[PDB]
Amino acid sequence: GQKVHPIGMRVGIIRDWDAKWYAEKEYAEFLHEDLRIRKFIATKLADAAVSTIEIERAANRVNISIHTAKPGMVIGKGGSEVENLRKELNKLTGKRVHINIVEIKKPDLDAKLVGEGIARQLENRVAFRRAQKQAIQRAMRAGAKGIKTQVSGRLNGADIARSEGYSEGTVPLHTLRADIDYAWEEADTTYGKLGVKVWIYRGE
Template structure:
């Protein structure tokens, strides 16, 4: 069987960029990856009708920048334009609760201090009061260390988020938006073949170079699961300079879960 490579991961650093752009040390990296997943899952679940294509996250020292690419940006902004401020406050509150449950800064800092002491110590004699190597910390230094630790904990547990909404000018050229519309039709018990042809016609009107759609599962309620796919135009998956947009979604039907995969070819990028 052929071994498949993710089309976006295959082109990272060539024609594609990471959806999360930040730098972190080894100890904090897994926590921040899970935070990005938590933020994306929260936004996708809350704004199902907004047609979100992708969410990009950038981090600085004390701020998180969230860029939301959506087909219907008015759902985020609203008429009085106060929805964006309410969304920012909601994200900050949810993220603060998430960090309080899953990440204890005080424990991490205490662990780091003990690790530093163990590395600097030539023996365990520095912890014994009767030993000549005993290191006694003054009260002022203890207070300073405690205050510094509390400041770090407060800054980490109270994140500052800035939200930017970017409206997609031509959403039918984005695989994420097309996949969401196809999933919506399948969940309404529509014919999968008709839904695939409708999605291809919409993409052809948007002047894409090529598109491939694949649906897997119990199609139309069949007892035996199978895979059906359809393609129009060119979809060169092995060409690195090809601008391939890829998305995979799941449709929850009464017969089970259907897997939807979409590849869209938007021309070549000459770097």
């Protein structure tokens, strides 16, 4: 293998961490509470289709935020769902949690959402080729600069594994002022587990 996780390079330089705090001498509880909370909202993603998670740090409380393409579905009917969040969270935390929400815009040009969708389609035994192609269809036409898409594994629920994908636009990688995103998902019907990885580029 040879390549480098691309949001593992622009981190710190032009894009910043997504857990903004500072903890000297208290640096395992904070980490393994952040991990706990980050894991336990995977229930929402089943339908809410969230993208990001921040972990701010109060004086003695927990302020976070999220983004998802459906604000009504997450907060619920009369905001009661967010209350179930609060009460499950503080019980999970032992610390007063103060959540917040912002709506994501142009949810086509994300990366985790797109991988979520194409893995979804691959679950329903659909042709990977047209899946990738219509993904990049709706993506590029939303206004972008380049997309690549890779798929690997026991393709078409078939014999010895392979990998191949298609790309339009143009995506420079070794350059740094790139702001390129990246997302990697998984699925399978009955043949082990497949692999899809997606890269976008939306400005330097």
